[PDB]
């Protein structure tokens, strides 16, 4: 059931912005670890005396890394005279965010038809405003509302990256590519799922995406065509094993973005390339499941994957899940930074062809029981 | 002239500690860019609820990257019950340092015979105490005094990395090596050279190392055997071209560490390997000099380098200087992070064999005039 109740026209995920203490080192690490090319910049070299911002791209995926300069460089400026390319940026907000949460996502940005309208309708329907609509060089409009914790939902609309950003020099722009193509979903952890859902569904009109002792309850909000997917988790307390959602909330100092799921056009190539670089500056992956997991895969997905595709999952630690319509290949990195908070998921979806429908195969919640089962019986 | 006036016994540079907002991403970037192996850690996985600290090593060079966790993780602790492995660490000091200066060196650490004695003698001779001597697991003693800005000189002495640090798992520890072997010198930028020299020479007994419109005045303080080398720069104002020391002070919010010089056993291999990785997560280098610079090299160092070693300098952008005793090969990276502040120098010294004497060939200040000259005549 999809009531298509969006209160304004939503297109696709546009970008994800990390707030950093040093954008250069985070961006360079991410570029090498994920195979994303340096595509645009806004910084001292482009006249921006406020913040350093670097954009990485892989296919349609856009990762933005931003950090503040010394406020003294821009102390003479006022908002009408700002050299910032992202007018919502605030030194104090950025420093407070990173000292509170460490490295993490500040903005989940979606492209809309009309960012001023999206902002107005959102706030009229309960959204907490974060930054009012601002038109950039008469070409792009950006507005922000609170999503959860200190994460904002950013609306971007284009009349025709952002004004004031410059393209990166070819010598400075090495064409890395490990097969990642777009953001599939972005997941938040909150203390209470009910109020978080009521709030976000309330101001967007996003609807609950149909699903099918893991320490969580979750639900997924989705746009009309179910290409913007925003799952939200809450912890389940009292368990023997402590909820990883509760661990997140403690180390993050509250609610925030838990993981980003990046769609690959070839998850096997992506995982070969990322795993090659794990120990030389890239990303680590969670501990692989025991062989019983892959032994149990023939009974579960033998009609979708060959034996030569299943043992290849075993080689790379890929997980597999399935719903009524499609099949999901997924794997999770270790946390992206110092704290056990944000991580990345790599995903490939098989099925639901009409183009592929959104969320084809679900989000892998069956892998919770399947992993525990495989572990126990592996003993 | 070397009066050998050290007020306490100094051995060698021991490590350099960067204060970061996220130690993981900085350490992984540096490891790949410089060919340094992950060697030890102190973090949540080792029981440290205070700070995340990661050690990179290449030969005798030790780079430590530290960032604070949420204070809430350790709010029940007191200094007698701390889980920090570096007892001088303070959340507030670290967050203040990184918000003020961005990514940079907090501690220049030298190994001494007796860190408690070094601290006491230093403070008795005018050193401003930063952290009193503390004995770690009855095995290592660490103490800190102010050096310049918010940079400390850290004394480390061993009765026999640090207690509480654990060695990094072999699978997590990839044996990168581009030929870097030790720290040659560490350079500070200050507003006024005179008072900075009087202070540091005053409490160490370090002596002025003999030298031979660049925007700076500088002097070098050295230990008895001239293996601990601490150059200090001040800006020269009024010039046509603005002093890079003044630019540093403005963007750094005052005095701090300007550059680290890393000795390579083979600067050609090091620069080939680093330059290969510049655009894939590593470090960039300053713009190469014009061909007139390398055309002028035969007249200056033709008795030390072959033609096949000189054009190889041209290929890699290596600079060359010479004093009365030895020859210096050097090159400079672009700034290591967002701000135009700290950078790295790669160095190889030729000559002064007895082992090699310290500072053999000087610090390359002739390359200031030689670079400008080559540029002008290249036109
Ligand atoms: C780390 C850990 C700790 C305890 C037990 C298991 C594991 C490892 N693990 N197993 N199965 C998973 C299945 C799905 C997902 C998602 O993507 C989610 C999503 O997208 C929306 C719905 C909520 C999800 O959780 C994730 C993270 C995992 C997972 O992390
Ligand atoms: C970036 C810039 C801007 C203006 C003009 C020239 C350049 C490039 N440049 N040329 N020659 C150099 C020669 C030596 C050194 C050192 O190592 C120092 C040292 O170790 C102690 C003594 C003080 C030094 O400066 C350095 C950084 C450079 C250098 O940076
Ligand atoms: Co997911
Ligand atoms: Co130098």
Give a topology summary.
2 copies of one chain form a homodimer.
Chain A: E1 10-19, H1 23-34, E2 37-42, E3 51-58, E4 61-68, H2 91-101, E5 104-112, H3 115-124, E6 129-136, E7 140-148, E8 151-158, E9 166-167, E10 180-189, H4 193-204, E11 207-208, E12 216-222, E13 229-235, H5 244-252, E14 256-264, H6 267-276, H7 291-295, H8 297-301, H9 307-316, E15 319-322, E16 326-332, E17 343-351, H10 366-378
Function (chains A, B): Catalyzes the conversion of 4-hydroxyphenylpyruvic acid to homogentisic acid, one of the steps in tyrosine catabolism.
Catalytic activity (chains A, B): 3-(4-hydroxyphenyl)pyruvate + O2 = homogentisate + CO2
Protein name (chains A, B): 4-hydroxyphenylpyruvate dioxygenase
């Amino acid at each position: 059931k999809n009531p298509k109740s969006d209160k304004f026209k939503v297109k696709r995920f546009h970008h994800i912005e990390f707030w950093c203490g040093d954008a250069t080192n985070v961006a360079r690490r991410f570029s090498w670890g994920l195979g994303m090319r340096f595509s645009a910049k806004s910084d001292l070299s482009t006249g921006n005396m406020v913040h350093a911002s670097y954009l990485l791209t892989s296919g349609d995926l856009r990762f933005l890394f931003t950090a503040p300069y010394s406020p003294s460089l821009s102390a003479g400026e006022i908002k009408p005279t700002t050299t910032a390319s992202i007018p919502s940026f605030d030194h104090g907000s950025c420093r407070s965010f990173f000292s509170s949460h460490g490295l993490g996502v500040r903005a989940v940005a979606i492209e809309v038809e009309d960012a001023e309208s999206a902002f107005s309708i959102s706030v009229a329907n309960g959204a907490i405003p974060s930054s009012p609509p601002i038109v950039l060089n008469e070409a792009v409009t950006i507005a922000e509302v609170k999503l959860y914790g200190d994460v904002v939902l950013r609306y971007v609309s284009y009349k025709a990256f952002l004004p004031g950003f410059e393209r990166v020099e070819d010598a400075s722009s090495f064409p890395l590519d490990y097969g990642i193509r777009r953001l599939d979903h972005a997941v938040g952890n909150v203390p209470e799922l009910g109020p978080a859902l009521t709030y976000v569904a309330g101001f967007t009109g996003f609807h609950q995406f149909a699903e099918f002792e893991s320490g969580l309850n979750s639900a997924v909000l989705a746009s009309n065509d179910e290409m913007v997917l925003l799952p939200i988790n809450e912890p389940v307390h009292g368990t023997k094993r402590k909820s990883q959602i509760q661990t997140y909330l403690e180390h993050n100092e509250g609610a925030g973005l838990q993981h980003l799921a990046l769609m690959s056009e070839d998850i096997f190539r992506t995982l070969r390339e990322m795993r090659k670089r794990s120990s030389i500056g890239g990303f680590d992956f969670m501990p692989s499941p025991p062989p019983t997991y892959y032994q149990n895969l023939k009974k579960r997905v033998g009609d979708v994957l060959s034996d030569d595709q299943i043992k290849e999952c075993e080689e790379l630690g890929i997980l597999v899940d399935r719903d009524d319509q499609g099949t999901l290949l997924q794997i999770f990195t270790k946390p992206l930074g110092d704290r056990p908070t944000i991580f990345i998921e790599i995903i490939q979806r098989v099925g639901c062809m009409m183009y592929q429908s959104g969320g084809c195969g679900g989000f892998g919640k069956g892998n919770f029981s399947e992993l525990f089962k495989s572990i126990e019986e592996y003993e």
